């Protein structure tokens, strides 16, 4: 009961939207046929016909199967899931596999071991393009728990902004101040937080040391139009 499954896992010769959606349907329905618990196996025949039935049992089908599989088969499966997230982003196919990954975290079966980091980095990047910014955030904080870096803090700030949460984003800048000092704080971070007064102070400090760089000129002008200092901006 894993010959037809291994074709549905390791096909991945799909170069369109409906091709990957076909990969999903074949994957989901193959999990129903296999599933050891007969309550799921009994929905197979229905699910072949009605497809939103197959989507609703996806996570439950998956877990039942994924517990039974033998390590090398788990790796065979996960490599194909990575390919679907990595190669070719479709709004339906990605958000199915993110909801699988999230469902797997809540289970005692433990999270999907994707790509060494439990795919914390992979799933975060993918959730950001799906515009699932709370999933994006959860993963980006797990990242931060393991080891804080400046690049993490930056993304953490922009995620909070996209998610309409500027006071939480402000807190990320306060963290930076204490634990990393000042050099790690870019001028752009103030700009993202709408700290136009403090961003201008930062771009002035930067433009003194460095020479006439196009990025730092526009960065400082961008602050002036936001402040509304039309006098200095026209100079």
């Amino acid at each position: 009961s894993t010959i037809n499954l291994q074709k549905a896992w390791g096909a991945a010769r799909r170069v369109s939207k409906d091709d990957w959606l076909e990969w999903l349907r074949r994957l989901s329905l193959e999990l129903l046929k296999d599933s050891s618990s007969p309550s799921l196996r009994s929905c197979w025949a229905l699910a072949q016909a009605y497809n939103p039935m197959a989507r609703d049992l996806f996570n439950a089908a998956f877990v039942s199967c994924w517990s039974e599989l033998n390590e090398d088969q788990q790796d065979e499966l996960i490599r194909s899931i990575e390919l679907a997230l990595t190669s070719q982003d479709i709004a339906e196919v990605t958000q199915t596999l993110l909801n699988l990954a999230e469902f797997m975290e809540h289970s005692d079966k433990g999270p999907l071991p994707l790509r060494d980091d439990n795919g914390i980095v992979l799933l975060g990047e993918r959730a950001a393009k799906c515009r699932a910014y709370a999933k994006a955030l959860h993963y980006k904080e797990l990242e931060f728990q393991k080891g804080p870096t400046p690049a993490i803090l930056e993304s953490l700030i922009s995620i909070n902004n996209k998610l309409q949460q500027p006071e939480a984003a402000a807190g990320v800048l306060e963290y930076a101040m204490k634990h990393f000092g000042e050099l790690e704080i870019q001028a752009t971070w103030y700009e993202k937080l709408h700290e136009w007064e403090d961003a201008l102070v930062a771009y002035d400090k930067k433009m003194d040391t460095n020479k006439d760089d196009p990025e730092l000129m526009l960065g400082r002008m961008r602050c002036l139009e936001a402040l509304g200092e039309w006098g200095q901006l026209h100079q």
Binding site: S35, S37, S39, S42, M53, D56, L57, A60, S67
Partner: peptide, 15 residues
């Protein structure tokens, strides 16, 4: 998990 599978099947069937 053994209770869970019927329960999720039923909920999906009764939708």
């Amino acid at each position: 998990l053994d209770e869970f599978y019927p329960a999720v099947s039923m909920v999906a069937l009764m939708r």
